[PDB]
Amino acid sequence: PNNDNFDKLYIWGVHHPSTNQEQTSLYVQASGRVTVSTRRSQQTIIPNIGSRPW
Amino acid sequence: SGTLEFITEGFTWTGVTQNGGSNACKRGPGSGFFSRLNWLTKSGSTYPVLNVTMPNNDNFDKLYIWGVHHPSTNQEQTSLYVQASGRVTVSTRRSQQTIIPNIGSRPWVRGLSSRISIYWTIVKPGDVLVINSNGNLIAPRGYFKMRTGKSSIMRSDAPIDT
Amino acid sequence: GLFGAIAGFIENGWEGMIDGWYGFRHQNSEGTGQAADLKSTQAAIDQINGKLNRVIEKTNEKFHQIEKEFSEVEGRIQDLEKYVEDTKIDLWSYNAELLVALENQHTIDLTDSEMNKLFEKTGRQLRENAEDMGNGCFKIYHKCDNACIESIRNGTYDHDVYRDEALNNRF
Amino acid sequence: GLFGAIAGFIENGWEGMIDGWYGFRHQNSEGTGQAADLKSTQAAIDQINGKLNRVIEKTNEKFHQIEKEFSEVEGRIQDLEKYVEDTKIDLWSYNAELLVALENQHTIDLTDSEMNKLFEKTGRQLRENAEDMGNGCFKIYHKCDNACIESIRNGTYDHDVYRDEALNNRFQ
Amino acid sequence: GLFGAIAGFIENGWEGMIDGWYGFRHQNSEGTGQAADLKSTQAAIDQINGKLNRVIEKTNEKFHQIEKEFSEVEGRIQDLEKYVEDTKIDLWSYNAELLVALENQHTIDLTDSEMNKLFEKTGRQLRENAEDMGNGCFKIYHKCDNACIESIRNGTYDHDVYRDEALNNRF
Amino acid sequence: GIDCTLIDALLGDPHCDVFQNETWDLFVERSKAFSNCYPYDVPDYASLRSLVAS
Ligand SMILES: *[C@@H]1O[C@H](CO)[C@@H](O[C@@H]2O[C@H](CO)[C@@H](O)[C@H](O)[C@H]2NC(C)=O)[C@H](O)[C@H]1NC(C)=O
Ligand SMILES: *[C@@H]1O[C@H](CO)[C@@H](O[C@@H]2O[C@H](CO)[C@@H](O)[C@H](O)[C@H]2NC(C)=O)[C@H](O)[C@H]1NC(C)=O
Ligand SMILES: *[C@@H]1O[C@H](CO)[C@@H](O)[C@H](O)[C@H]1NC(C)=O
Ligand SMILES: *[C@@H]1O[C@H](CO)[C@@H](O)[C@H](O)[C@H]1NC(C)=O
Ligand SMILES: *[C@@H]1O[C@H](CO)[C@@H](O)[C@H](O)[C@H]1NC(C)=O
Ligand SMILES: *[C@@H]1O[C@H](CO)[C@@H](O)[C@H](O)[C@H]1NC(C)=O
C-alpha cells in the first residue's frame, strides 16, 4: 500500500529466456506471466521465448 | 526514404517449404504472392524451429519487411505449420518483437477469412538480424536500402503533366 | 495620411498625371502645362518596390511533414496532429493579416510624405518670391515664363533674380 | 510624438477643452473664447474607432481541441501536448504584446499628426496676416472680431480682406 | 525617412559632430563655431534606449520540453515532434525578422523626425528675422554675435530686439 | 454530467442510465463523478473519451 502522501515509482521487469529448456529450468512453468496493477490501471506481461543476438 | 531499392539476401530456410502462394494473389495465371516476401510452410510432416541470422556488414541502415500469418481455423494452422500454435520472433541487438498468431475468422476478403500482419525492422551498420519461428512466419527475402532526404508522398487525383 | 497632403491640403489626385506619381501643374503668361517630378516619383516607387521585394522574397521550402487529412477517427494522436496544424494556420493567417495592415498603412503614409516633401522643397526654392495658397498651389509673384517654371522644376531656380520684382508685387 | 505638436510646440493640453479633442482659443477686441475643431477631432476619432474595430473584430471559434490538463504522468505524448500548447500560448502572447505596442505608437503619432495638420491648415488660411508665435498660437495683425475668428474656424476666412491692414501692422 | 530632413533637405551628416547627435553650425561677425543640442539628441537617445530595453527585456525561462534530435527512425510520433518544433522555429524566426524590420524603420523615422523638429523650433524662434535657405541653414538678417547665436541655441533669442534691423535687411 | 463521466454514461453504468441517447454540444464532467458498476479500465481511455465526446 501507498500510505505516503507522494507518488511512488516502481521499476520492475520481465525476463525473456532463449529456450523452452531455460524457461522451465528457471521458472518451472512452461510459460510465465507478470501482472502489476493499481486500483484503476493494470499491466500484464507475457515473456517471449527464443534466441536473440548474443 | 524515397526509394524502393531492394536487395535480396541468401537466407537459408532449413526444413521448410518456401515460396508459398495463394489464388487470392495470382501472378500471371497461377497462384503467387508478394514479390518481396516468402511464405514458409511445413516440409513433409514437420516444421522445425527456424533460427536464422543476417549480419549488417554494410555502412547504411537496412529495412527488413516481414510478416505473420493468421489462419482462420485450427485445421489450417496445423496443416501449414504442424504446431498447434506458432510464433515469430524478430530481434536486433537493441530491439525485439515477438508475435503470436491468432486463429479465427476475419471478414472474407478475396476468398480468404485469414490475414497477414506486416511488421518492419531496421538494422543499423554493425547490428544483426535474428529470426526465430516455429510456425506462421512470413519471411523477408532481403532488405530495402534506407536513405534520408527530401522525399515524400501525397494523396491526389490530379493528373501529371509536363 | 499622417502628413495631410494626399487626401488633405491637396484636394484631389490628378487622373491626368499619367507619366509620374507626383508633379507640377502651372499657369503663366505663356499658357499652362504639366510635368511629372521624377525624383519624388522615383522615391515612392523605389520604397514600394524595395518593400514589395522584401515581402515576396524567399518562401520556405518544406518536404516531408505531417498528414493533414485523415480517413479514420483515431482520437488522441490525430487530435494532436489536427490541433498543431490548425494552430499553425491561424498563426500564419494572423501574421499575414498583420503584415498587410502594417505594410499598407506604411505604404500610404510614405506616399503622403513624398507629396509633402516635394511641396516643402518647392516652397524652399521659392523663398520669399511666392506664397502657399493652401491647396498645394503657389502663387508666384513675378513674371515667370516656361523656362522659369522649368527652372523651378529642375531645381536651378535662382530666387535672387526675381526677388525684387516679387516683393514689390507681394507688398 | 513624431510631429512634435502634442507634448511639443503645444506646451500642454487643455483640461478645459471638454467638447472636442482639438480646438481654438482666442483673444480679440470683443474678448476671448473657445471652440472645438470639429473636423480634426472627428478625423482622430474615426481612425481610433477604425483601428479598434479591426482589433476587436472576429475572435476565432474553436470546438474540440486537445486536453491541456492531466491527472497522471504519461511521458512522451503528454510532453508533446503540453509543449504545443505552451508554445502556442507564448506565440500568441508575443503577438498580443506586439500588436498593442505597435497600435499605441501609431495611436500617439496619428493624434500628434492631426494636431500638426490642424495647425498647418490654420497657418495656410492666414497667409501673411498672422505669425506663428511658436507655441501653437498665431498673432493676428488686424482687428478681428468674433465673426472674423469664427470665419477662421469655419474655413471661410478671406485673407485678402485684411491683408492691407495686417501687413501694415507687421512690417510698418 | 518620412520627414525628409536626414538624407533630405539636410544634404549630409556631420562626421565632425562628436559630442551630440544633432546640433548647430554658425557663421557670424566673430567667426564660426559648432555646438551640440542636448535636448533633441537626448530625445532620440531616450527613445532608442527605451525600445532597445523593451526588446531585450525578459527572456522566457523553459525547463523540461521535448526531444528535438533523434537517433532512430520512428515514424508518426517523431514526424510530429519534428514538425511541431520546425514550425515553432519558423514562426519565431518570422517574428524576429518582422520585429527588427519594423523597429529599424521606426528608428530611422523617429531620428529624421527629431531632426525635423529641431529645425522647425529654430525657425519658430527666429520668426521674421531669418529665412530658411532650404539646406538646413538659416540666413539671419541682422548682426548676430556669439551671444546672440547662443541665445538662439539656448532658447532665449528675443526676436523683437532684432526685428526692425532684420526686416530692413530682408526687405 | 453530474455523477457521471461521459464514459460511465456510454457503457451504461446504472446510476448514469438517465443519460441514455442524450446529445450535447458541451458535455460537463464534474469532479464528484464516480463509477458504480464492474471495475474496469479502457486502454487508450483518453482517446475513447475524446472520440465519443467529439
Ligand atoms: C534493385 O537493386 C538492387 C541493388 O542494386 C539489385 O540487386 C543487385 O542484383 C544484381 C543481379 O543479381 C547483383 O549482381 C547485385 O549484387 C545486386 N546489388 C546489390 C547492391 O545488392 C536488384 O537487382 C534490383 N532489383 C531488381 C528486380 O531490379
Ligand atoms: C464465422 O462467421 C463468418 C460470417 O458468417 C463466416 O464468414 C462466411 O464464410 C462463408 C463461407 O466461405 C462465406 O461464404 C461468407 O461470405 C462469409 N459470411 C460473411 C457474412 O462474411 C466464417 O466462415 C465463420 N468462420 C468460421 C471458421 O466458421
Ligand atoms: C540461433 O541463431 C543465432 C545466430 O547465429 C545464434 O546466436 C543462436 O545461438 C541460435 N540459437 C539456438 C538456440 O540455436
Ligand atoms: C532647367 O530648365 C531651364 C529651362 O528649360 C534650362 O534653361 C536650364 O538649363 C535647366 N537647368 C539645368 C542646369 O539643367
Ligand atoms: C462662418 O462663421 C460665420 C459667423 O458665424 C457665419 O456667418 C458663416 O456663415 C460661417 N461660414 C460658413 C459658410 O459656414
Ligand atoms: C543663453 O545664452 C546667453 C549668453 O551666454 C545667456 O546670457 C543667457 O542667460 C542664456 N539663456 C538662458 C536662460 O540660459
Side-chain angles (χ1 to χ4, degrees):
Chain A
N2 188 351
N3 293 317
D4 287 294
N5 61 11
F6 48 82
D7 292 351
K8 295 178 177 185
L9 172 66
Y10 289 94
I11 302 302
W12 50 274
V14 181
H15 184 220
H16 308 265
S18 61
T19 67
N20 290 306
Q21 171 179 26
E22 183 179 349
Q23 169 69 36
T24 54
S25 165
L26 294 181
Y27 306 126
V28 178
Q29 278 70 255
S31 56
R33 73 187 174 237
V34 177
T35 297
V36 178
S37 55
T38 64
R39 253 181 222 128
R40 289 166 186 85
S41 83
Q42 71 184 4
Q43 299 164 87
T44 66
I45 310 304
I46 302 299
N48 315 306
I49 299 156
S51 300
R52 291 132 168 106
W54 262 42
Chain B
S1 181
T3 180
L4 290 176
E5 284 161 67
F6 183 90
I7 296 80
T8 296
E9 293 175 308
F11 288 91
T12 303
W13 303 110
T14 300
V16 289
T17 302
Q18 296 182 48
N19 309 313
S22 179
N23 285 322
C25 184
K26 297 173 196 195
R27 183 179 288 285
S31 66
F33 199 68
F34 299 104
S35 66
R36 301 315 193 182
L37 293 171
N38 189 351
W39 187 359
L40 307 180
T41 56
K42 68 174 184 60
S43 177
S45 60
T46 54
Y47 184 117
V49 180
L50 305 173
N51 185 50
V52 303
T53 184
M54 191 62 65
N56 187 350
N57 293 137
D58 286 294
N59 61 11
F60 49 82
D61 292 351
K62 295 178 177 185
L63 172 66
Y64 289 94
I65 303 302
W66 50 274
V68 181
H69 184 220
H70 308 264
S72 61
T73 66
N74 290 306
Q75 171 179 26
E76 184 179 349
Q77 170 70 37
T78 53
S79 167
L80 293 181
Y81 306 126
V82 178
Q83 278 70 255
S85 190
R87 172 187 51 81
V88 175
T89 297
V90 177
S91 55
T92 64
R93 252 181 222 128
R94 61 191 94 161
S95 83
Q96 70 119 4
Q97 298 164 87
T98 297
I99 311 304
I100 301 299
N102 314 305
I103 297 156
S105 299
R106 290 77 168 162
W108 191 266
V109 169
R110 294 186 281 293
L112 294 180
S113 56
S114 308
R115 291 295 187 272
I116 291 175
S117 298
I118 292 291
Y119 297 94
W120 60 97
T121 306
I122 295 176
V123 183
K124 291 168 179 174
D127 208 332
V128 183
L129 186 72
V130 181
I131 299 177
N132 182 285
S133 181
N134 69 332
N136 302 73
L137 170 63
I138 303 299
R141 293 193 179 265
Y143 66 89
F144 295 85
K145 183 173 176 179
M146 289 271 295
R147 288 183 189 275
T148 69
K150 76 169 179 185
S151 304
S152 188
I153 186 161
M154 181 179 294
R155 301 185 181 89
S156 178
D157 285 339
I160 303 179
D161 176 22
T162 41
Chain C
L2 292 170
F3 295 87
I6 290 182
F9 68 81
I10 309 294
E11 296 185 21
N12 54 271
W14 292 332
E15 293 185 348
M17 167 139 281
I18 68 178
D19 65 344
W21 283 24
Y22 304 100
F24 299 93
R25 283 179 179 185
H26 70 270
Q27 178 157 220
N28 60 11
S29 60
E30 308 200 62
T32 63
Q34 179 183 257
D37 184 74
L38 173 68
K39 282 175 183 174
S40 51
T41 288
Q42 195 63 56
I45 286 170
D46 284 347
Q47 288 175 71
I48 296 178
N49 279 335
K51 158 219 308 295
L52 179 57
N53 288 155
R54 292 225 64 199
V55 163
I56 65 180
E57 179 180 39
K58 282 175 92 302
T59 59
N60 67 162
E61 202 169 34
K62 301 301 185 189
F63 299 118
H64 197 55
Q65 298 159 59
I66 54 164
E67 302 297 338
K68 301 174 178 189
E69 290 179 22
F70 303 87
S71 60
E72 288 79 43
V73 164
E74 297 174 296
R76 187 177 188 165
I77 295 308
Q78 188 181 127
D79 290 335
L80 185 58
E81 290 161 327
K82 286 178 161 184
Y83 187 77
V84 159
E85 189 65 8
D86 200 44
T87 288
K88 176 183 175 193
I89 289 165
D90 282 351
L91 287 160
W92 277 111
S93 299
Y94 175 85
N95 288 336
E97 196 70 37
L98 179 67
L99 176 60
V100 310
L102 292 172
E103 290 275 10
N104 290 347
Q105 194 84 29
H106 178 256
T107 295
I108 291 165
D109 288 332
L110 82 86
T111 53
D112 191 18
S113 159
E114 290 302 326
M115 181 77 271
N116 193 58
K117 291 190 263 189
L118 182 56
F119 184 79
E120 291 195 357
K121 174 168 128 158
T122 304
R124 280 167 174 138
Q125 290 192 257
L126 294 169
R127 285 284 287 272
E128 300 302 322
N129 301 348
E131 300 174 13
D132 179 350
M133 300 171 56
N135 62 348
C137 293
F138 292 101
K139 185 173 175 170
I140 296 169
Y141 281 86
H142 62 84
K143 296 183 178 185
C144 195
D145 66 12
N146 287 350
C148 177
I149 289 296
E150 178 49 31
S151 78
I152 303 159
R153 294 189 311 222
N154 70 17
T156 67
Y157 173 86
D158 185 345
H159 82 101
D160 272 309
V161 164
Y162 303 103
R163 185 177 172 102
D164 281 342
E165 172 180 3
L167 290 179
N168 180 245
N169 289 320
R170 282 180 69 201
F171 291 146
Chain D
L2 292 169
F3 295 88
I6 291 182
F9 68 81
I10 311 294
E11 295 185 72
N12 54 272
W14 293 332
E15 293 186 348
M17 167 141 281
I18 72 178
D19 65 344
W21 283 24
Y22 304 102
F24 299 93
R25 284 178 180 185
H26 71 270
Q27 178 157 220
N28 60 11
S29 60
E30 308 200 62
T32 66
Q34 179 183 257
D37 183 74
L38 306 183
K39 200 174 183 302
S40 49
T41 286
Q42 194 62 56
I45 284 170
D46 284 347
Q47 289 175 71
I48 294 179
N49 279 335
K51 60 171 55 177
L52 178 56
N53 288 155
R54 291 224 63 200
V55 164
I56 68 180
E57 179 180 39
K58 282 174 92 302
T59 58
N60 67 162
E61 202 169 34
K62 302 301 185 189
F63 299 117
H64 197 55
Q65 298 159 59
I66 56 164
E67 302 297 338
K68 301 174 178 189
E69 290 179 22
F70 303 87
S71 61
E72 288 79 43
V73 164
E74 297 174 296
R76 187 177 188 165
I77 290 308
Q78 188 181 127
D79 290 335
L80 184 58
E81 290 161 327
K82 286 178 161 184
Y83 187 77
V84 158
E85 188 65 8
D86 199 44
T87 288
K88 176 182 175 193
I89 290 165
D90 282 351
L91 287 161
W92 276 111
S93 300
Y94 175 85
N95 288 336
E97 197 70 37
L98 179 67
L99 177 59
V100 312
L102 292 172
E103 290 275 10
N104 291 347
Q105 194 84 29
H106 178 256
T107 294
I108 291 165
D109 288 332
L110 82 86
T111 51
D112 191 18
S113 159
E114 289 302 326
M115 182 77 271
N116 193 59
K117 292 190 263 188
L118 182 56
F119 184 79
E120 292 195 357
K121 175 168 67 157
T122 305
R124 280 167 174 138
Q125 290 192 257
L126 294 169
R127 285 283 287 272
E128 299 302 322
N129 302 348
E131 299 174 13
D132 179 350
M133 300 171 56
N135 62 348
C137 293
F138 292 100
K139 185 173 175 170
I140 299 169
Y141 281 86
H142 61 84
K143 296 183 178 185
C144 194
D145 66 12
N146 287 350
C148 177
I149 291 296
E150 178 50 31
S151 78
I152 302 159
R153 294 190 311 222
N154 69 17
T156 66
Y157 174 86
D158 185 345
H159 82 101
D160 272 309
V161 162
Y162 302 102
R163 186 177 172 102
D164 281 342
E165 172 181 2
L167 290 179
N168 180 245
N169 289 320
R170 282 180 69 201
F171 291 147
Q172 289 147 301
Chain E
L2 292 169
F3 295 87
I6 290 182
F9 68 81
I10 310 219
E11 296 185 327
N12 54 272
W14 293 333
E15 293 185 348
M17 167 139 281
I18 70 178
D19 65 344
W21 283 24
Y22 304 102
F24 298 92
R25 284 179 180 185
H26 71 270
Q27 178 157 137
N28 60 11
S29 60
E30 308 200 62
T32 66
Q34 179 183 257
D37 183 74
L38 172 69
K39 286 174 183 172
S40 49
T41 286
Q42 194 63 56
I45 287 170
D46 284 347
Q47 288 175 71
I48 297 178
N49 279 335
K51 61 168 54 177
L52 179 57
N53 288 155
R54 291 225 63 199
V55 164
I56 67 180
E57 179 180 39
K58 282 174 92 302
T59 59
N60 67 113
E61 202 169 34
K62 301 301 185 189
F63 299 116
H64 197 55
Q65 298 159 59
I66 53 164
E67 302 297 338
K68 301 174 178 189
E69 290 179 22
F70 303 86
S71 61
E72 288 79 43
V73 164
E74 297 174 296
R76 187 177 188 165
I77 295 308
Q78 188 181 127
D79 290 335
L80 184 58
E81 290 161 327
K82 287 178 161 184
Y83 188 77
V84 159
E85 188 65 8
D86 199 44
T87 289
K88 176 182 175 193
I89 288 165
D90 282 351
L91 287 160
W92 277 111
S93 299
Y94 175 85
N95 288 336
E97 196 70 37
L98 179 67
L99 177 59
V100 310
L102 293 173
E103 290 275 10
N104 290 347
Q105 193 84 29
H106 179 256
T107 294
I108 288 165
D109 288 332
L110 82 86
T111 53
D112 191 18
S113 159
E114 289 302 326
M115 182 77 271
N116 193 59
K117 291 190 263 188
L118 182 56
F119 184 80
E120 291 195 357
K121 174 168 128 158
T122 303
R124 280 167 174 138
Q125 290 192 257
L126 294 169
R127 285 284 288 272
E128 299 302 322
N129 302 348
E131 299 174 13
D132 179 350
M133 300 171 56
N135 62 348
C137 293
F138 292 102
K139 185 173 175 170
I140 299 169
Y141 281 86
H142 62 84
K143 296 183 178 185
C144 194
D145 66 12
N146 287 350
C148 177
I149 289 296
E150 178 50 31
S151 78
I152 305 159
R153 294 190 311 222
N154 69 17
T156 66
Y157 174 86
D158 185 345
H159 82 100
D160 272 309
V161 163
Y162 302 103
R163 186 177 173 102
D164 281 342
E165 172 180 2
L167 289 179
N168 180 245
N169 289 320
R170 282 180 69 201
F171 291 147
Chain F
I2 315 296
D3 294 332
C4 300
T5 59
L6 176 60
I7 292 298
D8 283 338
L10 175 80
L11 302 176
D13 187 337
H15 82 289
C16 303
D17 272 331
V18 284
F19 292 108
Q20 278 189 357
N21 271 22
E22 267 284 8
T23 67
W24 58 92
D25 290 328
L26 190 66
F27 192 98
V28 179
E29 287 183 326
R30 306 305 197 171
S31 68
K32 69 185 169 175
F34 60 90
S35 298
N36 199 22
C37 194
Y38 206 100
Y40 71 91
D41 78 296
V42 185
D44 212 357
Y45 185 98
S47 282
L48 178 56
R49 176 175 174 281
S50 174
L51 73 85
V52 177
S54 187

